Every structure is written in structure tokens, then in C-alpha cells.
Design a binder for this molecule. Structure first.
Ligand SMILES: [Mg+2]
Lengths: 55, 55
DNA sequence: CCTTGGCTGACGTCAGCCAAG
DNA sequence: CCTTGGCTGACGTCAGCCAAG
């Protein structure tokens, strides 16, 4: 029926919600991780900076 | 009254749906901002190590 | 060159929670 | 402590889109 299309679309949306959820999580990770990198790198670049032309 | 609230409520849900929005945007952004500073430091690194100790 | 249907924004409503009155 | 406001999540509906025949 119209009643069937309704159900599917119900369910759909549900799934469809999980997703966004997930993709935002993931994003929320990444950044963390990127945040990691980026900081460590800067600590790296520091120390090398730390022993120049030799000391 | 029952209505009045609904109405108020409905406008909250709007504003909020919007804070989310942006939020995912924000993320999406720094994700790349990060992504960026990130290559760069590495190159910057890539530089100085091999230009370290003398060559 | 059309029909479909899946997918997904956006809405408004119902719940519960957590300040702040 | 109330209780009562606001905010937020999860939910169903509805509308429009673009692939896949
Ligand atoms: Mg949303």
C-alpha cells in the first residue's frame, strides 16, 4: 500500500540516521589523531631545531 | 498553553538542528586544516634532517 | 529516453536531563 | 529542595535527488 511505502521509508531513515552518526564520530576521531600527529611533529621539529649546524 | 509551548519547542529544535550542522562543518574543516599544517611540517622536517650534521 | 525506488535533508513532536528561578 | 525551561536526542513524515534498468 501507501502503508508499505511508509514502513520502508521509516526503516530507511533509521539507517540513514546511524550513518551520519557514524560519520561524525569518525570525524571526531581523526581530528584527535591529527591533533596528535601535528603536535608530535612539532615536538620533533623542535629537537632537530635543537641541535643546529651541529649543537 | 499546549500550543504555545509546541511552538516554542519547535523553534528550539530548529536552532539546534542548525548547531549540529555547523558542528559537522567545523570538524570537516579543521580536519583539513590539520591535514595541511601536517604535510608542511613533515616537508619542513624532510628538509632539516637531510641538511643535518653537515649533509 | 522514461520510470522507478533508494537515500537523505529537513521538519515538528515527544522525552527526558540538567541548570537556574 | 520544587518545578519548571530549555536543549537535545531519537523518531516518523514528506519532499527531491539521482542511479539503475
Ligand atoms: Mg541532524
Amino acid at each position: 500500500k501507501r502503508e508499505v511505502r511508509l514502513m520502508k521509508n521509516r526503516e530507511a531513515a533509521r539507517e540513514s540516521r546511524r550513518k551520519k552518526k557514524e560519520y561524525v564520530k569518525s570525524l571526531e576521531n581523526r581530528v584527535a589523531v591529527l591533533e596528535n600527529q601535528n603536535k608530535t611533529l612539532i615536538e620533533e621539529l623542535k629537537a632537530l631545531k635543537d641541535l643546529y649546524s651541529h649543537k
